RNA sequence: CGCGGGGUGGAGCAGCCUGGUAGCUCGUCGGGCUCAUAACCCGAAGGUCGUCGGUUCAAAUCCGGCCCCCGCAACCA
RNA sequence: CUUUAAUGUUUGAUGUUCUAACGUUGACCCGUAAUCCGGGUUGCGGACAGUGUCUGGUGGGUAGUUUGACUGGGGCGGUC
RNA sequence: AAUUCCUUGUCGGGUAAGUUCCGACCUGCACGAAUGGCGUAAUGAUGGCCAGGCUGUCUCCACCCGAGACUCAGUGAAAU
RNA sequence: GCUCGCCGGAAGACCAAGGGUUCCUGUCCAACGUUAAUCGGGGCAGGGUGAGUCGACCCCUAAGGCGAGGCCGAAAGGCGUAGUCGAUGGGAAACAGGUUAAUAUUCCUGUACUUGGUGUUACUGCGAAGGGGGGACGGAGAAGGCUAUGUUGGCCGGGCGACGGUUGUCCCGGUUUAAGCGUGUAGGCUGGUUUUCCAGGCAAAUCCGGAAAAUCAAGGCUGAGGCGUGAUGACGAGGCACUACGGUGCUGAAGCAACAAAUGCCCUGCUUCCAGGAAAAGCCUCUAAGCAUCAGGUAACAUCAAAUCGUACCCCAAACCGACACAGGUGGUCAGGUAGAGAAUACCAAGGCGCUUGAGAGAACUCGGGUGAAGGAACUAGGCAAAAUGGUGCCGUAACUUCGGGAGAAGGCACGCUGAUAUGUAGGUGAGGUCCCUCGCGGAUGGAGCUGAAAUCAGUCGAAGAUACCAGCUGGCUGCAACUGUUUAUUAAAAACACAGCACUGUGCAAACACGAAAGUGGACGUAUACGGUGUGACGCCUGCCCGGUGCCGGAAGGUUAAU
RNA sequence: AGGACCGAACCGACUAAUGUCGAAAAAUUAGCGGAUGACUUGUGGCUGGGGGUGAAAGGCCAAUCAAACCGGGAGAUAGCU
RNA sequence: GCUUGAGUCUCGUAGAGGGGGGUAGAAUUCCAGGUGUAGCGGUGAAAUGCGUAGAGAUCUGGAGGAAUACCGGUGGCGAAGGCGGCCCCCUGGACGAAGACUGACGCUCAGGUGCGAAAGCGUGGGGAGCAAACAGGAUUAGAUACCCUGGUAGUCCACGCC
C-alpha cells in the first residue's frame, strides 16, 4: 500500500507557500487569522 | 487506394487501410510548422466541455493557404504530403518566384501540374478564382464564405459544392448536405473536388484505432445511474424515457436552428 | 377470505348507466332463382333477460343471498 | 338604419428600397516588433440582429416540500 | 431457455441409481426481431455437465521433519 | 579470531526525492531498544561537508500560472494582449592516482579544457526586439563494426604441499592504465564550384529559396573504436622494516597475445509502416535605422576573473511514506563466474549480513511440509486443496472454420559419459609470408593459432540420463459475451462497461452542444467523407405489422388567447 | 506487421490457507492474469462541493462520499432515550 | 513436292458490335411566383386520397434522374446472351475486288478456361418515373387477387460475385 502522503517540498511550497497565500485575497484572510490567533508557524517553511 | 489486411491477429481481421503510394515519405517543410498541443476537450476554466476528447497521438500543425492571395503567379506542385490534422491530402506547391505553400489537393492533381490563382486563371482543377467568372454548373471547393475570410465550405475528403445559379450579385451554391446556400460572387473558390476520396472506406477495425486518433470511449446513459444521466437507473435495462441529451434537451429530432440572421441566405433547408 | 366485471333466442355481442318499449350478424324454417347445391333475393317465427326474494305504478335494469365463469391479489422476513 | 363612392384625416398590419443607429469572431493601416483591443478607411448586412422591462407558453434540467389515522406487527381490503 | 410458476413436465441419451447436464416435443403462467432475433471459428484467472489421468479429498487415518503450544529466567499487554 | 550458515539483477555498491547531523571519535547507562547491554541511529562534549569543469543559481522555452493597459462583471473578482515566470527538456568546459577517525571528478601530484573582461601586434567594415540555416526530435525490426567485461595461453613471483599420489598437460595470485591532442578508419549523409537574373523571405539582404547556363568530376560534413601520445609516470602481487601491536614507512618483477561478446557506443544511423512524430535560446550567417582618423569583428600572445548555495549520512530502508527500530510501498544507473535461451533458477566472487529475546521438553492441538500399503472422487454444494503434466530436435495431428487458425491439439521417439569419423568436423575469427597501389587504420591472396555446435556408429554405468531448482493437465458437450482491455482502492473481475462496425438525428460555422451572471474559450486553428447526442454492440442470414396514448417534425384557415 | 504466443522485472489482484485485539486500519505464502500496448511510471501543472472526475460501480475526490473536511449560523430542532 | 482446304498482305464497303469521355430536345415529378376558381384524380360504379391553409387547369423560370418519339422495316451486327438520339477517341468481326505468298500450318474436342438476359447479393453514390413487399379503399360468400390511391427494396452508375 501507499499511505496518502508522499512529500515533495516543491509542491508543498507551491500550494501552501507564503507567496502561494499572499497572492490571493482569501489567503490574506488566513494570515490575518493566524497572526490574530498568534500562531508562530504561520505557513510551511524552513 | 483501398486494401484489406489478412486476418492474422484478432483485431486485424477487420482493419482496412487507405494505402497511397504517392504520399511523400519524409518530414515536411519546417518553416511552415508550429506545435499543436492538445486541449483535451477542456476550456479556459479547465472544465471538460466537449466529452470523448482526450489522449490521441501528438501531431504538429501545418500551415495551409486557404486565402490564395498570390495572384497571377504560376505554381508547381512538388509532392502530395500527408497531414494529421485533416482527412484530406495536402500538396506542397512552389510558386514561380520562389515561395512554397501548402494547399488542399484536388482529385486530379499529379506531381508537377502547373496551377495558378488570381482572377484571370484558366478553368483547371486547383486554380482559384472569384465565383463571377466560374461557369454555371461547374463544381468547386474551399469556398470563401465572407470576402477575405479564407475558406469555410467543403474542406474535407471528397467534398465538393456545386454552383447552381447566379442571382446577379449573389450566387447560389448547392452545398454538400443538399442544402441551398446564398453567397456573394466576390468570394474566391478553388476548382475541382478535394482528393483522397477513399476516406469513406477506411474502417478502423480495432478499439485502439480510435484511441490514438483522439477519440475517447462513450458511455451510454442506459448504463449510468439517474444521478449522472437523465436516463439510466432501473433494475435491468429500462429506457422508458423520451431520448434526451445529458442536459435534458430532447434529442432524436429536435431542431436547434437558431441564428435567425442567416435565414436570408438559406434558400432550401437540408431535407 | 377480499375487490371489479359478467350470465340476454341455437351461438357470439348491444341495450342497464339515469327503471314502463328488447336490437345487430350468423344460424333455422318456408318459397323463389339453377338441372341440383352454395351464394344471392323476399317473408316470418323464436329470448323463464342464471335463480330466488325484497323495493317500486312498473324490474333486463335498483339492492342482497347463492351457483357458474373471467381477471387481479394471496405479500415482508 | 343598411348597402356604400370620392376627399380630407387618423393609426394599425405587410411589401420593397435606402444609409446614418447597430452588428462586423471580412480585408487593410496606425497606436505597436502584439493573431487581445481601441481608432480610422472600405466592403457586406441593416433598422433587422441583439440586450433590457413586462408577458403567455414549454419545463424533475433544478430547488423547497407533501405523500392521513385506526389497524389484535405492517401492507392490502374495510372504515372514518 | 440467464425467461416455463405449475414441475423433479413428457420421451430419448448418459448412470447400478441423474431435482443438474445434452438433444427433441410445444401445454410460450409471462420469448421475439437495434430496451435487436437466431447461429458463430477464435478467445475467456467465466456458468453447468461428463470421461481419462493422478493423487490422503475420502473409505480410515498412521508415522515423521520443523515454528508455537508446555517448563525455567527477563520484559510485559488486551477486550471485559 | 577460527569454523558454520544466508542474499548475491540482492538482503551489494552509488544518486534524485525526502528527512536534517542520524555521519566520525571519546565517554556515560537512569529514560529509549519489546530481555541483559561496558552496545547502539539513546544522553553529553568535541570534530567533520574545501568545486571555474558535478548539480542548482544563470541563458532559453512546454503544460500551465501571474498579468501594464484592455474587455467584462453588484464588489470581491474572471479572462486575456505586450511581457514575465515556470523543468521533468535544450545550452560552455576534467580524467587517473594518492590521502582521512569522518570529505573528496571539490584537497595534493601530473596532464588538459571552456566562457569572457583588459591590453599589445597584424588586418578588416561592423552593427538589431528583423530574415534564413541549425538546434530539431515517432514506433518497431534486423545487420555490420567495436568496447565494457570474461576465459585461455604465454610470461613473472610464490608453492612442491599435516592419510595414498603431484618437478609436471601441476597448483595459486597478478597481468591495471583515463581525459585531452594528433591521425580522421569501419560506416552514414550529399553531386561540388562559378557567372547572371528575380512579383519570395512585414523593409533591405552579398544569406536562404527559385529560374536559366558553364566546367569538372569529386569535394565536403559527420563518425564509435583502433594505433601513437599522455606514461623511462602512477599503480602493482610479494618482500624488506617498526609495533601505541589499529597499521605506517620503504621497495617493487611481468604488465602482452588470441578468442568469445552485450540490451552499452557508432545509432540524436539505415530500411519499413502508420496512428505522421515540442518550442525558444546559445551558435553560424545576412543586412536595416545608423556609426566610419573611430567603434567593433577575426587570429595569435600576455595577464586577470570564473562569484553565491548544496556537498556530511541514509537513499528498495532501525533515518523517506506507514503512530512503532512495522514481514508493506519508493523513480534512475553499474551489474561478474559455471550451468542455462535468459536480468528465470541453482551454487558462488566483490561486498554485506544471521533478521534484538533465549534455554530445555518433544503431550494434545494449530500452522508450514515429506511419505504412505489396498481402492482411486465412494469426499463434497463443487475435484476447493494437493497430486500430476512440465525442456529441446524430430515424427504425427480431428470436428469445425471467417481458410488466419484449431495446434505446443491429442499422442510418441531419442536425451548421461567415453572413444572414433576428426591427437576437436562443418562453421567463425584470423597473424606471419607473397603481390599490387590512386601509400593508408588499404585491397586480394594466404592459411598457423585460437575456438566450437550438431549428426552417426561403437562401448560402458544405474532402478531412474529434461535425473536438482526450473518447467502446460488433456479431451468431449454446452450457456453467455465476439475477441485484448476497463471496474466496486479495502468482501462482487462477471453474462456488467468499453469496443471497431451499423443506424437515427441534430449542426451551413459568429454551427449545434458545453463551462461561464459577462467577456472569453472549448468544439477546431477542424468545417457535412466533419462535429455533438442517443441506441445497439465483430461477423453471417435478417431486422415483420401498428401513428390509437406520448414525444417529436411540418402547415397554419378558424375558435380560444397575456401584456400593451 | 500484429490491442500475436510462452514467460521475468514492472503493473494488476482470480483461488485457497494463515492472519482477524494481525507483522500490516486488506498484508504474507504457494499457485495465477497482462507483459510492443487501450502498456507502465517519475517530475510538474489543470478540473472542486450540488461541483469535479468517471471504459459508469452511484465508484473516487487525503484510512470519511446517494453528496469531503474545517470554521461560523448553533447551546439548530427532538411529541424521543 | 503441288494445289482446288486453311491462313496472311494490298484497296474499299455497310453497320444498335464492344469500351471510354461529352451533349441535345420532349415529357414527367417537385419547388418558387403570378393569373384565377370550385372541384380534381379514378372506375363497370364507387371509395380511400388531393383541394377553399387555396388544388387541378395555365404561363415563365429553375433543380433534378431516367428513357431515347417520328426515322424503324420477318431491316442490320456479333459466337451467344444481346445491342439502336447524336458527337469524339480507341477497337473487333464479316463480305466483295483483281493478284501474290506460306504450302495441309487442318476438323472436332472429355477434363479445363472464358464470356454469359433478368432477378438476386456486398461496398459507395443516386432516386423523376415505375414499382416486389406492405397499408388503405373497393369487388366479393371470403380477396392476405384481378381494379384504384400511395408506396420501401430494386430498377439507373462504378468495382466484384452468383
Curated annotation (Swiss-Prot), chain A:
InterPro entries xref list: Ribosomal_bL34, Ribosomal_bL34_CS
Organism: Escherichia coli (strain K12)
Transmembrane segments: none
Superkingdom, taxonomy of origin: Bacteria
UniProt-listed Pfam families: Ribosomal_L34
One cellular component (GO) term of this entry: cytoplasm
Annotated keywords: Ribonucleoprotein, Ribosomal protein
GO terms assigned for molecular function: structural constituent of ribosome
Gene symbol of the encoding locus: rpmH
PROSITE patterns referenced in this protein's UniProt entry, alphabetically: RIBOSOMAL_L34 (PS00784)
Subunit structure: Part of the 50S ribosomal subunit.
HAMAP family registered for this protein in UniProt: Ribosomal_bL34 (MF_00391)
GO biological process: cytoplasmic translation
Protein name in UniProt: Large ribosomal subunit protein bL34
Family: Belongs to the bacterial ribosomal protein bL34 family.
Coiled coil regions in record: none
Swiss-Prot record, chain B:
Residues found modified as N6-acetyllysine: 241
PROSITE patterns noted in UniProt: RIBOSOMAL_L2
GO MF assignments: RNA binding; rRNA binding; structural constituent of ribosome; transferase activity; zinc ion binding
Region span, Disordered: 27-52, 220-271
Coiled coil as UniProt keyword: no
InterPro entries: NA-bd_OB-fold (IPR012340), Rib_uL2_dom2 (IPR014722), Ribosomal_uL2 (IPR002171), Ribosomal_uL2_bac/org-type (IPR005880), Ribosomal_uL2_C (IPR022669), Ribosomal_uL2_CS (IPR022671), Ribosomal_uL2_dom3 (IPR014726), Ribosomal_uL2_RNA-bd_dom (IPR022666)
Signal peptide residue numbers: none
Composition-biased stretches (Low complexity): 38-47
Superkingdom per UniProt: Bacteria
A biological process from GO: cytoplasmic translation
GO cellular component: cytoplasm; cytosol; cytosolic large ribosomal subunit; DnaA-L2 complex
Keywords assigned: Acetylation, Ribonucleoprotein, Ribosomal protein, RNA-binding, rRNA-binding
Note: This protein can be partially replaced in vivo by its H.marismortui (HmaL2) or human (L8, from the 60S cytoplasmic ribosome) homolog.
Subunit composition and interactions: Part of the 50S ribosomal subunit. Forms a bridge to the 30S subunit in the 70S ribosome, contacting the 16S rRNA. Interacts weakly with S6 in one of the 3.5 A resolved structures. In pull-down experiments interacts with CedA.
NCBIfam families (alphabetical): rplB_bact
Its biological purpose: One of the primary rRNA binding proteins. Located near the base of the L1 stalk, it is probably also mobile. Required for association of the 30S and 50S subunits to form the 70S ribosome, for tRNA binding and peptide bond formation. It has been suggested to have peptidyltransferase activity; this is highly controversial.
Similarity annotation: Belongs to the universal ribosomal protein uL2 family.
Entry protein name: Large ribosomal subunit protein uL2
Species for this entry: Escherichia coli (strain K12)
Gene: rplB
Amino acid at each position: 500500500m501507499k499511505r496518502t502522503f508522499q512529500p515533495s517540498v516543491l509542491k508543498r511550497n507551491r500550494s501552501h507557500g507564503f507567496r502561494a497565500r499572499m497572492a490571493t485575497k482569501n489567503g490574506r484572510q488566513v494570515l490575518a487569522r493566524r497572526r490574530a490567533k498568534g500562531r508562530a508557524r504561520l505557513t510551511v517553511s524552513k | 487506394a483501398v486494401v484489406k489486411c489478412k486476418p492474422t491477429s484478432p483485431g486485424r481481421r477487420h482493419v482496412v487501410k487507405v494505402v497511397n503510394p504517392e504520399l511523400h515519405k519524409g518530414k515536411p517543410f519546417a518553416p511552415l510548422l508550429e506545435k499543436n498541443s492538445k486541449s483535451g476537450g477542456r476550456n479556459n476554466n479547465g472544465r471538460i466541455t466537449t466529452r470523448h476528447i482526450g489522449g490521441g497521438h501528438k501531431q504538429a500543425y501545418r500551415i495551409v493557404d486557404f486565402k490564395r492571395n498570390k495572384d497571377g503567379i504560376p505554381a508547381v506542385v512538388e509532392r502530395l504530403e500527408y497531414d494529421p490534422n485533416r482527412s484530406a491530402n495536402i500538396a506542397l506547391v512552389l510558386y514561380k518566384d520562389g515561395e512554397r505553400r501548402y494547399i488542399l489537393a484536388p482529385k486530379g492533381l499529379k506531381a508537377g501540374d502547373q496551377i495558378q490563382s488570381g482572377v484571370d486563371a484558366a478553368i483547371k482543377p486547383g486554380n482559384t478564382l472569384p465565383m463571377r467568372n466560374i461557369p454555371v454548373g461547374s463544381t468547386v471547393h474551399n469556398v470563401e464564405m465572407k470576402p477575405g475570410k479564407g475558406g469555410q465550405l467543403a474542406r474535407s475528403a471528397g467534398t465538393y459544392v456545386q454552383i447552381v445559379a447566379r442571382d446577379g450579385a449573389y450566387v447560389t451554391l448547392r452545398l454538400r448536405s443538399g442544402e441551398m446556400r446564398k453567397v456573394e460572387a466576390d468570394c474566391r473558390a478553388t476548382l475541382g473536388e478535394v482528393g483522397n476520396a477513399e476516406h469513406m472506406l477506411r474502417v478502423l477495425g480495432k478499439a485502439g484505432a480510435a484511441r490514438w486518433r483522439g477519440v475517447r470511449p462513450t458511455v451510454r446513459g442506459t448504463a449510468m445511474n439517474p444521478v449522472d444521466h437523465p436516463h439510466g437507473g432501473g433494475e435491468g435495462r429500462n429506457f422508458g424515457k423520451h431520448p434526451v441529451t445529458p442536459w435534458g434537451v430532447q434529442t432524436k429530432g429536435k431542431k436547434t436552428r437558431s441564428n435567425k440572421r442567416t435565414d436570408k441566405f438559406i434558400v432550401r433547408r437540408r431535407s
